Structure formats: C-alpha cells, structure tokens
Design an enzyme around this catalytic site. Structure first.
Site, PDB file in Angstrom:
ATOM      1  N   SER A 161       0.777  -1.472  -0.021  1.00  0.00           N
ATOM      2  CA  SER A 161       0.060   0.125   0.144  1.00  0.00           C
ATOM      3  C   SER A 161       0.835   1.372  -0.004  1.00  0.00           C
ATOM      4  CB  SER A 161      -1.084   0.136   1.200  1.00  0.00           C
ATOM      5  OG  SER A 161      -1.899  -1.039   1.218  1.00  0.00           O
ATOM      6  N   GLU A 218     -10.369   7.159   1.744  1.00  0.00           N
ATOM      7  CA  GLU A 218     -10.027   5.744   1.645  1.00  0.00           C
ATOM      8  C   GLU A 218     -10.968   4.661   2.447  1.00  0.00           C
ATOM      9  OE1 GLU A 218      -5.859   3.145   1.797  1.00  0.00           O
ATOM     10  OE2 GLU A 218      -6.440   4.320   3.454  1.00  0.00           O
ATOM     11  N   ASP A 274      -9.147  -3.501   2.330  1.00  0.00           N
ATOM     12  CA  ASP A 274      -7.916  -3.971   2.500  1.00  0.00           C
ATOM     13  C   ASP A 274      -7.622  -5.033   3.518  1.00  0.00           C
ATOM     14  OD1 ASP A 274      -5.013  -4.365   1.249  1.00  0.00           O
ATOM     15  OD2 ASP A 274      -4.813  -3.654   3.510  1.00  0.00           O
ATOM     16  N   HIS A 303      -7.214  -9.320   3.525  1.00  0.00           N
ATOM     17  CA  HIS A 303      -6.250  -9.910   4.081  1.00  0.00           C
ATOM     18  C   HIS A 303      -6.548 -10.952   4.932  1.00  0.00           C
ATOM     19  CE1 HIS A 303      -2.712  -7.484   3.028  1.00  0.00           C
ATOM     20  NE2 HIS A 303      -3.099  -6.790   3.098  1.00  0.00           N
ATOM     21  N   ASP A 338      -5.604   0.913  -4.856  1.00  0.00           N
ATOM     22  CA  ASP A 338      -4.083   0.951  -4.866  1.00  0.00           C
ATOM     23  C   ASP A 338      -3.221  -0.083  -5.431  1.00  0.00           C
ATOM     24  OD1 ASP A 338      -5.084  -0.536  -2.745  1.00  0.00           O
ATOM     25  OD2 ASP A 338      -4.144   0.744  -1.558  1.00  0.00           O
ATOM     26  N   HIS A 339      -4.183  -1.407  -5.051  1.00  0.00           N
ATOM     27  CA  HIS A 339      -3.845  -2.779  -5.611  1.00  0.00           C
ATOM     28  C   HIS A 339      -4.801  -3.588  -5.252  1.00  0.00           C
ATOM     29  CE1 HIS A 339      -2.860  -1.808  -1.221  1.00  0.00           C
ATOM     30  NE2 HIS A 339      -3.397  -2.994  -1.072  1.00  0.00           N
ATOM     31  N   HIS A 365      -1.262  -9.645  -0.978  1.00  0.00           N
ATOM     32  CA  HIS A 365      -1.479  -8.657  -2.353  1.00  0.00           C
ATOM     33  C   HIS A 365      -1.286  -9.669  -3.636  1.00  0.00           C
ATOM     34  CE1 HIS A 365      -1.040  -4.479  -0.163  1.00  0.00           C
ATOM     35  NE2 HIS A 365      -1.833  -5.369   0.467  1.00  0.00           N
TER      36      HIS A 365
HETATM   37 MG   LIG Z   1      -3.992   2.834   4.504  1.00  0.00          MG
HETATM   38 ZN   LIG Z   2      -3.033  -4.864   1.867  1.00  0.00          ZN
END
Ligand SMILES: [Mg+2]
Ligand SMILES: [Zn+2]
Ligand SMILES: [Mg+2]
Ligand SMILES: [Mg+2]
Ligand SMILES: [Mg+2]
Ligand SMILES: [Zn+2]
Lengths: 400, 398
Positions: free
Chosen positions: B58, B222, B227, B231, B269-270, B362
C-alpha cells in the site's frame, strides 16, 4: 467495413496483467506496454441469464456476444425459451457480407458455435457441426476433425467448401469457402509447438479472403486454449496461449493500418480458474522461473513416465532443479499416473512462482474490452457483454 | 476547482464485480448498475519500483497516486533514493488550496501518510504522525488515537487544530483545521457497526469545510478496511466495507451535482487476497447466504467462545443453520481460541458461498479507474497508476 471480434476465452484481468509482467524485459528499466494495454477501452459484465446464477459458461457468454441476448449456461444462440436468436454473422450474411471463424479449439466448440449455429445445448457437437453448413460461413478454421464425418465433409464440398487438414495447405487457399480442420479435437498447446504463430496464420488467412468482399465482413477469432489452460490451472501453458492470442491481435492491428475502414474488438467471454499474480502471503510473482519452463506439465509428465531415468529430464523442462522434498512428491505422483503427476508438477510450479488459483472452473469477475478503429470509443467504460453485440451490430449496413 | 481522490484499498476488479452481485436485488429480474459501473473509465497498472518486483504494497502504490513516482514497497512519498517527493497535497497547498484526508484506518496509515508526509518507511508510525503537523492539512479524519500523544495533540491545537474523538462532535465542527481520531487504531467494521454511513459522514464533513475555499481543494477518501478484510479472507466483512465506500462515493456524486467545477477519481491502490466469485469447481456464487451473515466472523467467534450456550448464537449470526460436520469443526476450533475459531467460520462461509482466495497478501492484477466531472475523460483506457497523479496535478491552477 471489416469487423473482427476476438475472444480470449477465459482471459480475465489477471491474465492480461500477468502477460505484461511475464513478457517484461528484465534488462529494460521500465515495464513495456503489451498490445492489451494499448487497446484497452473498457470492461464488461459476464453474467448469464438469471436462471443460471452469476457465473456464466462459454456457451452463454458467447451467445451474449454474438446475439446481444442473455441465456442459460450451455445455450448456443437460443434464448431462455430455447428460441433461436439471430447472430451478428446472420445479420452480416443478410447484408451480403462475408463471415468466418478462426479458433484454437474445435471449430464447433461453444464460442464459434454461438456465432454460426443454433442449438439448445453446446453438448450436441455433430448436430452443431452439421448446422454450420447452413451458416454458409466463408471461412471455418480450427480443430475438430473428430466431429465431421466423411459424408458431412462431402456435403461441405458440394456447397463449395475446400477441405484441408494441414497448415501446409493454407497457402493454396485463395478463394472463399474453406473448411480447415487442423486437429482431431483442439490444436496443439503453444508451449509444446514449433512456435506461437498458428492462430496468427489462421487469422491472416481469414483476413486475406474476407477482405476481398467490398461489402465487408465479420470475423471471429478465438484464443480458445487460454481457457483450457486455466481449467487445468496451468500457468506456463496459459501464458503461452496468451502469446499466441496476442500475436493474432497484432496480425489484425497491421491489417487495420492497411485497411482503415475496420473495427477491431477484443474481449474475454469470462474469467477462468481464479488466477492470481502473487499467492500464499507472497508479495511477488517469479516470472524468471516460468520463462524457464519449456514444456507443458502434461508434456513433462508424459515424458517422465516414459523414461526409466526421468529426473534429469524433468529439471531440464522446468528450467530448474527440483529439491529433495519436491523430488519425492514427483516420485510418488509418477507411480500413481500421468494425471497425478501433472498435478504434482503444477503444484511445484505454482508454489515456486507464487501463482494462485481458486477453482478449476469459472469465476464472475468483469473482463476487459479492447478495441481499435474509427468506432473504438463506442466500447468505452462499463457495459454488459450483450452491449458489445448491439454496438458491433449497429455498424452493419442499412436495412434497405 | 474541487478535487476528490477516493481509494478503495485492495479493491481489485473482483471486489467491485462481487459488490454488484452481492447488491443485486433478488426481486428484480435485471442486475442493477452500481456506482462503480456508472463511473468506470479505465484501468491502471499497480506495480511498484522495479526493485520491489511486480507486487506492490500500500505504501508504494499510495506514493505513486500521490506523487506520480514509483518507489519501493514501504516507501512513503520518497523515491528509490529516499528523496522526498512533492505530493499533490503540497502542490495544492502551494496554490492556496485546502487539503484533507478521510479514512477508515489510522490517519497515519500508508495511503493517507503518502499524501501528507515523507518517510523512508511506513512502519515509522510515530514520525509520520508528527510529520502531519507540518502538512498543514485542513482536515484529518479517521482512527489512530494510539499514535497521537497528548503532547503531540497539544501541538496540533497550537496550530489551530480542533481535536475531536467522537462522531457526535462532527456537527460542532464548522471551520478549517480539525484532527479527528475516532478509534485507537482503525474504525469499526461496517458489518459490526450500527450502519454503513461512518465514512460518508467523514466525507461529507470534509466537503463542507473544503468547499468553503474559493480556490478549491484536494481531498483524499480511503475505504481502508476493504484491504484489511481482504487480508483476513473475510468476504462478508469485505462486502460491508464496500458498501460503506460506495456510500461515500455517492456523497461525492451528490456534491458534484451541486458543484459542477469538480473532479472525482476513484481507483484502487492494488488488489488483495486473490478474491474470486465462484470457487472449487463451482460455477456460482451464493449471494443469498452471505447477505444472511449479520456479523464479522471475528465478532461471531468472540461471542461464541465467551458464551455458554453458543450453538444457536452462531447459526443466528451466520443466517443459516450449520450442519453436523461444521458444528464439530467449530466446536473444536472454539476450544483453541478466538483466532482458530474465526478461521473455521470463514472456511465454512467460503465453502458454502463459493468464494475463493489465493493469498493473505496482495496480487498484481490491474485495478479499475472511475471518474466524474468535466475532466473525467483524462482517465480513460489503460494507464499506469502514476499517471493518475499526473493528470490530477495538471488540473491544478497556475
Ligand atoms: Mg491505509
Ligand atoms: Zn494490504
Ligand atoms: Mg470455444
Ligand atoms: Mg491477480
Ligand atoms: Mg472473480
Ligand atoms: Zn472454460
């Protein structure tokens, strides 16, 4: 105008992203753009008709792309009520334009089948093959010798088709109506063939014939084996099929540079395998290792089983030497057969390269839409896969 | 003009596609479009600087989006030679524009950190926090009370910052310079909260303040916990975070309808976890079952291990009655602890929902780019993530 619809069967976003990194030159600083990067214009939803859920199969997705209608998984150009739909190829013919298909799977496989025939089920191979004789398609190239009997071929010969079974015969084909069946079922994997230009040759030949019609044409080109590789969770073989598909796209790009009045559209029918660039907590994708794999796990397993002393052979084809742990895994697997051996090989390859998969089937992620030509912008942004059909159809000649 | 850069952390193509199906109304025959479907304009490559391989973290991707420069994994607005890079926020401030960040993770997490500070490592949470004191950002909203000592908060106050810690205090904030730390670390999961509107509130509050600057502004929003859920391979919690992010995006669309001179850009971002719609040979994704899950596996586990009569509790929160074999898998995991129980619950959720995952980290697949406003077309087609920064920066005044 000429029209080319190219389908990367099972080629979701991960496949094209992976291809970029796989082809990246380790000596050049930056990452070079691939043909997909240069042509990206949008994305498309791939879901089938409501009754089939959110995960489409190739028949339903191809039906959406050739007719602009959703339908159940397995459907071949028929709607949810099994009513036959008009494909873009029929529309083309009705407008006196030439048509054709060039694929790496059997010519009567789901995708090409949805463009030239109608059938309540993709499983009806012989009937679909026979139905292709009604499409009056000018070019039919790919595999599938198994599905065309001597008598069927005779009917094709009577209607003016030239039957060929070897790539060596392509050069002599210079006039419309050709039925080329270059393999019993699907064509050879690119990674195990002499080069990655077979699909490009079928493509270039299709354009050579089709373009002789001033009225235009609609050509379907399918990189069929990307999907098969995905189902096998075979990354090394998948990337090779990706190169074969990319080479064909390049063939068409060149054509367009020489024939400005053309529309090229490239997309995927759906995603396959749940492929992922990076896996098991690893933040990396070891492309150096994959590039070193010079054969398909199937090819490597077949050879390993045929040789008494096979270990050295396996390392030679993998591009690296297996360790003691992996060696014992290949050893046990070999005793159990070709299938179990291939799986053992793919597990090592995937673990070593950090390549992930989630299924041997399909997944529902949206796929990319690429295009080149004057009408390229009609395919920008998000759209449903059926919308791709409507747009290409909107470019065909006026009703009168 | 006003500018909003919204980041769905870890939100690869599978997440937005999953969200559409997850939200699909069972009653209507057609599948309704989502805000993502309506705004999609292109895609972006996410790889970091070459020394970090093809898979970005990130910090590296946030640095790309904020500075237009690639860098190593873990970098916070510094290049491969550890040189400080000028962020779009700095450029904005230099042009007399207002700036701000609204996130669900700690305000000093990788992404927001890349837009407001400079540091060789995302791990230096303390310095990053202290460094935000120099960004002069007008709005800083999110979690992270843990990283701001009383003395540091004291310094912010001296600079004109109003410090708050409860959403109840938002209404009382009507002027520039606010430090809002609404949790020790990250904000609560949407699925375990009262509603999915927390991020929408931080967003709306940012717009209210920022838009009072005639010169314009640059706001970063964000959806940080997408994310995190990714994970932990937590699909039910992930879909909830997507709802909260989608709501925030709706807030901005509304804004734009009322403020034509604005640019909205949404991207990821990914990708995270290798999420897949369908799995294990199954050609389907059971959305009817996920929708029935009313709490995070974490919450479900903690409650289950804490309770005496827990059987009915789990089924109640899962939305479906677990079977013989699943009960025993849970019974046993429950004996080891909250964590092992969570894994057992998630395994059941994924198995019965046909949701797949390939990693706890990721993956490199390109992500989507969405935009709204007059300059939306600048983000069409494929581009590298650093180019999103360049385009946004080109609309800055001067
Ligand atoms: Mg962050
Ligand atoms: Zn991440
Ligand atoms: Mg096919
Ligand atoms: Mg991936
Ligand atoms: Mg998927
Ligand atoms: Zn398939």
């Amino acid at each position: 105008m000429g029209m080319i619809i190219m389908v990367g069967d099972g080629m979701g976003p991960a496949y094209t992203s992976a291809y970029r990194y796989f082809q990246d030159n380790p000596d050049t600083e930056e990452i070079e753009q691939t043909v997909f990067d240069r042509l990206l214009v949008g994305m498309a939803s791939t879901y089938p008709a409501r009754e089939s859920g959110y995960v489409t199969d190739s028949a339903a997705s191809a039906t959406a792309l050739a007719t602009g209608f959703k339908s159940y998984n397995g459907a071949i150009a028929v709607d949810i009520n099994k009513r036959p739909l008009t494909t873009i190829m029929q529309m083309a013919k009705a407008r006196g334009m030439s048509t054709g298909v060039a694929v790496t799977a059997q010519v009567n496989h789901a995708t090409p089948a949805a463009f030239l025939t109608h059938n309540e089920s993709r499983k009806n191979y012989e009937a679909i093959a026979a139905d292709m004789l009604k499409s009056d398609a000018d070019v039919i190239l790919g595999g599938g010798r198994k599905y065309f009997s001597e008598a069927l071929v005779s009917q094709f010969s009577a209607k003016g088709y030239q039957h060929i079974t070897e790539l060596a015969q392509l050069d002599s084909i210079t006039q419309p109506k050709v039925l080329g069946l270059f393999a019993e079922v699907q064509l050879p994997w690119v990674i195990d063939d002499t080069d990655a230009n077979t699909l490009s040759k079928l493509t270039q030949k299709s354009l050579d014939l089709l373009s002789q019609n001033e009225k235009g044409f609609v050509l379907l080109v399918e990189g069929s084996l990307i999907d098969w590789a995905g189902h096998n969770n075979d990354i090394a073989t998948a990337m090779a099929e990706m190169q074969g598909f990319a080479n064909a796209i390049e063939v068409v790009e060149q054509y367009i540079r020489q024939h400005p009045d053309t529309l090229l559209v490239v997309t995927a029918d759906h995603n396959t395998g749940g492929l992922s660039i990076g896996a098991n907590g690893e933040y990396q994708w070891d492309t150096k290792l994959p590039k070193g794999i010079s054969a398909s796990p199937a090819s490597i397993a077949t050879h390993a089983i045929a040789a008494d002393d096979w270990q050295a052979g396996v390392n030679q084809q993998l591009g690296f030497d297996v360790n003691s742990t992996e060696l014992q895994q290949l050893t046990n697997a070999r005793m159990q057969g070709k299938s179990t051996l291939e799986v053992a090989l793919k597990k090592i390859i995937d673990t070593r390269s950090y390549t992930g998969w989630t299924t041997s089937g399909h997944t529902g992620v949206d796929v990319q839409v690429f295009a080149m030509g004057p009408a390229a912008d009609l395919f920008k942004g998000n759209q449903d896969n059926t919308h791709i059909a409507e747009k290409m159809m909107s470019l065909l000649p006026k009703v009168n």
